[PDB]
Design a protein around this ligand. Sequence first.
Ligand SMILES: [Cl-]
Ligand SMILES: [Cl-]
Ligand SMILES: [Cl-]
Ligand SMILES: [Cl-]
Ligand code: NA
Ligand code: NA
Ligand code: NA
Lengths: 271, 271, 271
Amino acid sequence: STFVAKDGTQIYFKDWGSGKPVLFSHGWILDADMWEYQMEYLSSRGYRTIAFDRRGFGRSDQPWTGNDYDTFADDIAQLIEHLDLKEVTLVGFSMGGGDVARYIARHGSARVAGLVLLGAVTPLFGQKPDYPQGVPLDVFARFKTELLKDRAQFISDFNAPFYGINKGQVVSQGVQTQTLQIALLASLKATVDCVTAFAETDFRPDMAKIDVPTLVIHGDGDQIVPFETTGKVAAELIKGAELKVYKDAPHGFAVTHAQQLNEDLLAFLKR
Amino acid sequence: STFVAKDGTQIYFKDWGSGKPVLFSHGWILDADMWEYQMEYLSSRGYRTIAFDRRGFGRSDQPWTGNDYDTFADDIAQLIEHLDLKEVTLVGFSMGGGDVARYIARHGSARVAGLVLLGAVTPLFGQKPDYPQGVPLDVFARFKTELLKDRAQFISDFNAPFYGINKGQVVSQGVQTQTLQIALLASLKATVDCVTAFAETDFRPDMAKIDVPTLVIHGDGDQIVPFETTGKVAAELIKGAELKVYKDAPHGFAVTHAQQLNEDLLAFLKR
Amino acid sequence: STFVAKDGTQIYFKDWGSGKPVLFSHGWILDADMWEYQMEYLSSRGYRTIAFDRRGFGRSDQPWTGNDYDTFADDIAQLIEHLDLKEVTLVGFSMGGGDVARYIARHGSARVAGLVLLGAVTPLFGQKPDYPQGVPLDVFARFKTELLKDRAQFISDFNAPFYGINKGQVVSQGVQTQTLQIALLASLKATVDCVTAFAETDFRPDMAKIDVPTLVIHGDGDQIVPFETTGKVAAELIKGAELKVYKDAPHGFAVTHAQQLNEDLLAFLKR
Ligand SMILES: [Cl-]
Ligand SMILES: [Cl-]
Ligand SMILES: [Cl-]
Ligand SMILES: [Cl-]
Ligand code: NA
Ligand code: NA
Ligand code: NA
């Protein structure tokens, strides 16, 4: 399915099952297919599951402009309104934690029953003057430099720390191939602009707007989005938030810890 | 090209050349590109060739519902209607043998000149009470179990027994890579639902409704769809059906025996 | 973005940034993504960049008919008129040199500010009776023969002389994988018809019609489109054309010599 965003960008989405809606927002250099197992799992157990390809990724159009969290958050508002969704549970992975958060911050929680943050960049990823513990901006400047020379090899090399293969996680060549294949569908522009977006956007104001039950899940072996300065802090900043830490789990834990995640999501939805 | 099915599912198809129409229905984790060499072969020789991506596969939309043979068969009826095809030769490979059989059973053969069943699951694939010789439903349960853990590696491992590379067939890395790339386009949901469909759907009633010239071709080294309990029996159950057995040919014989197949299809059309 | 050609073929394109327009025409078995670094480079520097997938390639539809240079030139004409582009700089790589030349020959240059021919098949590629220095036509017949047996492995094997990997150039596995992935999106029919087109089409008449500033760039280690009988001659035949020869550069020099190309495009635009 597709809908057309305010600026005319066509966004691809899947809308599966029937029942209370669960809307998934993918990570960086991925697309809606990253969620296929969670979607099948929940939609087979009486839920409606929705997942979109962020502008510039997967099967969506690739605009030059609007590759920023305010627009990502309004793309989500437009999807929710296109489907007239109610009592939605929002699930964001990695950079996708940011746009579900920003959606709540910009539009309020009237349509939202709950929030899940998975290996998420929230509440802030990069360094700020009052957050020297964040990731130094040099690190992200280097992602960009490498992407603007050879994004295909950057993606391939990124699989190892993403999935924690270099620290004894076991992920098949098939998954690594599918990950590269989907990432190559994305716009070069959107891939680079997203670095800018997740490196510098401060979601701490958003945390205080979150007035719905929230579950934060993060792997403490995450080599991409450090648990100590993201998930751990998000869980303290969001009122009433629950935190689950997957022991030694990598960033790419929706694959390495799929069954555990499916079960925790179902548990949260049934709370 | 695309048309929209009754439930709103957008279906991708190609329509090449001019003349009497030949309509192709692809096998399981594949899409319309599996037929590209037969399409080029016949369309350069005075035929019009049409092939679609089944719902949930390739470039088609991925509905949660309708992943069953009555719907697949009605999808084909809608394609035929959309293009207003007359005197069509239907060609089904593997699970696609089932939806062209079911189309004729559901809609009659007034628009149909002929039928070709290639490595096809017809007349019945899995066991029934009067069909213990079928494939045991636990084999299909295991496909599903592995798909629901890691479909990408499942597809990659499927190449060897699909093409018979484990039994001395020679297929390039390029073809193996293309097979995996197309398979990853598909929906996880449709991939698993098709197992249920081809495992349990009985096309024996359908065979009695086939009243057009029919050619059945099967490899007797087919490791995926056993010749003895499928193609051999379909050729006996369809009145006037002709049978060709490709000696030691694997399941993926549209690749390994491409030239022979082209020539057999051309000879059938020129009967 | 998409537009629909006169004959109903949907053609995919990207339209990035704002300012004076620069429209890119890709080579053979590639798509608009081959331009992504040049597009980002220029659109970040005050230009509008447009690139389309040639009919039968990448994300465009796959028509059986119209796979010839006159039609390719008319697709470009419709895109330009569709967007109402003025003072456009046309940039063609390899076989895409021919369709931007043919656009000017067929439609004149009222909308055109400048022309860039990169590793281009212009002014003619294959042998003719007055051009025995051209590539013998049996070389192309053999391309076609191999394509009609196994295009996936042909593409895979083509990467080495395309990028000059067999001759001192260094290109990552990621880039080779992305090249193959994009190439497999294309139509078998379009891939083969394009060989006929670039093998046999004479653009020498077109050269005398080019009445705008023109830059020819070619690698002199080009194993696919030999500099001496193409780019070298094109720069002599077009009045006032500038020639830059990249030393030891292969055919795939938008990859191996990306920065140099970016800077030369920018210099040409600002001349
Ligand atoms: Cl660094
Ligand atoms: Cl744990
Ligand atoms: Cl012949
Ligand atoms: Cl040089
Ligand atoms: Na990510
Ligand atoms: Na199959
Ligand atoms: Na080329």
